[PDB]
Structures are given as structure tokens and as C-alpha cells.
């Protein structure tokens, strides 16, 4: 058992600001250590599809500081997967869109993409991703920058090597769904569905059943079907598809 | 996202003990503070069915420091709620069950039992029904406050008021289903089903459709079913098979 949903929402506040402060203090400290780490890793885990949580912490000025992460600590990448996990479920939330939309922060973003760790990369990749995804009217950027992100987002997907480990667990598929059917932007549904492909390969017994509970089989017959789709995102579709074939008629 | 669970599961022990040094040190303050109470809902929500958590807390000194919160705060209601809720968890991990058994930690539960407050005497009941569940010989403290505490047990559920609010949440109702079928016990199985009958009426949305999908009507049909079962736990039991039909056809 745990407290009641209605007390849990009580403290997300005090929760985000008091780790918040600790990853303030250290980034001063310029102090790379266990508590960072340990810290950067609540806060994402807090931010897990809540977007009461992705509110507080843009509120009480999380971007800003987590900006200061990452210019702090350009070569620890334990420390940018973190900063970026967080800022990946930041960017599923769609009303916070236009906190996300300036040039410093997607400047950072679209550099990080370009990791040598896929580990960085891939949350780099799933910002844009969902950013991209809100189309061209939400994007208040400049156009060329929308139109690079896009080619270097395929492009780096198709780069990324099989991870060792998974880099990342999910509670739900829900927020990549609007991702496929981004027929327009193939680089889209390119992480979309590497990142499903990665966790159903990785941990089908955690993953599988809560896909195909979820609608994934239709979703992904719908790219399997679907007449002009970029290569890369059909072989993958089919991919997952064949792993939740499997899961039924066990 | 949230981070993966190998690397979860690496920093349980990190944030049980510095969770535990801050309740230690508020403790010692005699400081009953904001950060407190949040810093016990955290370490409660931690151990919502985590059994390594939970062995973690116990290797650690956690029953003796939360002894001594029950007893340095003992007109704080909403302190011992949230040290009983830890504890019920607690009780529900068998590999630890005898790590539970000193005599005065049972000597307090049975205490907090019988509390004025709901939502004391809610948890403690449910450390007691977890532990009186095990058998006559997993209960090594006396045998006759177990046969006491068996009925006390069923007798306070029989007083409680409705609360005002839920004042738990449940992810799995599965470490109930043990509890009911505990006939040679009743009350360990008035506490299950009320319970059960709590979270169901005040979120129905919520638990109803969980608790038919892991089978609580089998559960419950065996209880009603059964013949010579106590009156109030086929009552309870009756009550919720009804009140679920309304549910499974709406």
C-alpha cells in the first residue's frame, strides 16, 4: 500500500523543490557525485507521467537550472541521461509545449542528439521527437532548424547501435501513439518505434502484454498496411508486431 | 519514462538510509515538521509491495527507529498513520515476518489497535491479520495474546466509523486474496474484505475493474459460498459481490 493518490499530489511541490535545491547546491559545488546522481534520478522518476509534476518543476525554474546541469557537466553522461530522461516527459506534455521553445535549450537538445552515447542520445531524440510531433504551426523556432532537427533525428536513430541494458522503463505506451502517424516526419516514427522495439525485445514479459492491452497491434498493422511508409519505420513496425504476435498464441 | 529497474533496484539502499537519517535526526529534534511528514510518506510509498525495500528498511534499524517514533510522538495521528502504513507493508513480505516478532512491537501494534482514529487502527489491524495469517507456528511470542489478539482483531473492525477518506492506495489486491480463506481465522478475513469494501465504495472507478480482473469474485464467491462463515465476513463479502455486478455490466 501507499498514501492516497490526493496526498501524493499534496507533496509533489515540496518534493521537486527540495530536490531541486540539492541539484542546485551541487552544480554550485560543481560536485559530480552519488547524491547528484541519486537526486537526477528521483526527479525523473517523480516527472513519470505526471504532468502536475513536469509543472512544478518548470515552475519553480527546473529548466533553467537543469540547463546549468548541462553546461556544468558536458563530459558526465550518467548525469545527462538523467537531466534528459526528466526533460523527455517534460516534452510529452503537450500544454507545456511553449516552455520548451527557445533557442538556448533546443540549441543544447539538438547537440546532445549528436552523442557518441546512445544513452544521451535516444533522450535527445525523443524531445525532438515530441516537439516535432506538435507540427509545424507549434513550432516558433526558426523553420530551417524544425526542417535539420528532423533529417538529424532519422539520421541518428539509425546510427544507434543494440544498448547493453534498457536505458529507460515505461508505464505506458500512450504518449508514443500520436508519434506513429507522423507520416510527414518518418524520423518521428522512427523513435517511436525503435523505442518500443527496444523494450519488447529487451523485457517482453513487462512489455508485450501492456502494448497489445494498450491498441499497439492496430497501430502498428496500420504502418505494416500503409501504402508510402519510410522502410526503416515499416521494418521495425513489423518487428515489434512479429513479438506481439508472439505473445499471443503462447 | 522513469529510469530502468536494474538501476532502480541499485539505489533502494541509498535512499532508505538517507531517508531514515532524516527521521532519525527530526526525531531527535523532537521536531514533528513539514519535511517530516513527507520524509515518511516517501519511505511508505518505497516500500509499497517492495520487498527488497522493505528488507532493506528492516537491515537498517528501521522497526527500532520507527519504535521510537511511535513512542516519541504518540498524539500525532498522522505520524503513526504513515509509520503504520510502512509497517503494513512490512507485514506483508513472509520472509520478513520474523523479523516482526519481538514482543514489544506486537505489544505496541496491539495499542495502536485500538485506537480512537481510523486511520491508526486501520493499518494496525492490518499488521496484525498479515501476521496472525502465517500460523500458529510462524507465531513465536505467546500463543495466547495471538488467540487474544485474534479476537481483539476481529472486534474493533466492528466499531470503525466510515472515514472520511480513503486513506491508502492499493496498486494489487493480491495480498489480500491469502487473507480471505483464512477460516480457521475470522477477522484476519473481516479486515481483508472490509478493506477490500472500503477502497471499492469510496473509488469505484479504481478498484472495482481491478479487482474483478484478478480475481476477486472467485475469491469472494468462496467466501460467500462457503457455508459456515462468520456472519459479518459474509455480509462484507456479499456486499461487495453485489455492489461489483452493478460494475462487470454497468
Redesign the interface.
Known sequence: ????????LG?EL??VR?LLQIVKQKTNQNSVD?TLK?TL??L??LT?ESPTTCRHFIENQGLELFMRVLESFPTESSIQQ?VL?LL??IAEVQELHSELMWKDFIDHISSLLHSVEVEVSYFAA?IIAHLISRGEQAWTLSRSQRNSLLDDLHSAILKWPTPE???????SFNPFFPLLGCFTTPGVQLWAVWAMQHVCSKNPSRYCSMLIEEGGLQHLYNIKDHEHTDPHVQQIAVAILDSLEKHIVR
Do not use: H, L, P
Open positions: 500500500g501507499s498514501t492516497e493518490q490526493t496526498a501524493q507533496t515540496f518534493i527540495q552519488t541519486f534520478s528521483a525523473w522518476n513519470d538523467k530522461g523527455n516527459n525523443g541494458c534498457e536505458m529507460v522503463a515505461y508505464r
